[PDB]
A paper describes a structure:
In this study we have designed and tested the properties of a new protein scaffold based on the OB-fold of the aspartyl tRNA synthetase (AspRS) from the thermophile Pyrobaculum aerophilum.
To investigate both the nature of the OBody-HEL complex and provide a structural platform for further development of the domain as a scaffold, the crystal structure of OBody NL8 in complex with HEL was solved to 2.75 Å. In particular, acidic residues D32 and E93 of the OBody mediated electrostatic bonds with complementary basic residues on the bound HEL. The loop 4 (L4) residues of the OBody (positions 87–91) were ordered poorly and did not appear to make any substantive contacts with HEL.
Residue numbers in the entry:
A (entry chain D): 19 to 107
B (entry chain A): 1 to 129
The structure:
Amino acid sequence: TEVVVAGWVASLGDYGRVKIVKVSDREGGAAVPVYLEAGKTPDHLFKVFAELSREDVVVIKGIVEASKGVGRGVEIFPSEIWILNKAKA
Amino acid sequence: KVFGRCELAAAMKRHGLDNYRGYSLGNWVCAAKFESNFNTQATNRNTDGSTDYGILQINSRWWCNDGRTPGSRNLCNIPCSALLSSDITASVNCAKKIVSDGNGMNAWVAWRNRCKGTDVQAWIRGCRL
């Protein structure tokens, strides 16, 4: 199921083949993992991952799926990532 | 060195991985199995110029230093050869930092794709520990 989510970057992690951005809604709580995987994620997204920093506002489009296992939340596989907040000099 | 399943299980328990961050030992054996087929010498070069080194395939961009990747942080503070030894200590100490990064074991494609949500304690079944 395709989906659009929006919010601020809580944390960034680079693990090589997997890059994870955690996106959080205005008033805190849950922070949804967005997974960029080298086999699967379109090339350009990696470039924008490298531009992201904490507290940036993003609008992300992608596929939402339930996490494997009983730690029972949701995961997002992006096809586009847009950055909304004022650009850095 | 190509570890035995139970051998590595013991090796990992002794190095403190059991329940580290709430991941029971089966998870760690399971990740080794699929990341590196248990081979401590496993290395893999990604199309972006980074490389994954060792039994847990730690990536060279943020985690270790191998000299041959631009703008590289070395958050684990070790050279990437240290990850290719028979003594898994360095690999383990680096896995600890990684798994503590905020995403637990989600840092590992192989764990994600093949161990997460499964009966992971199957991987310590038949082991004398």
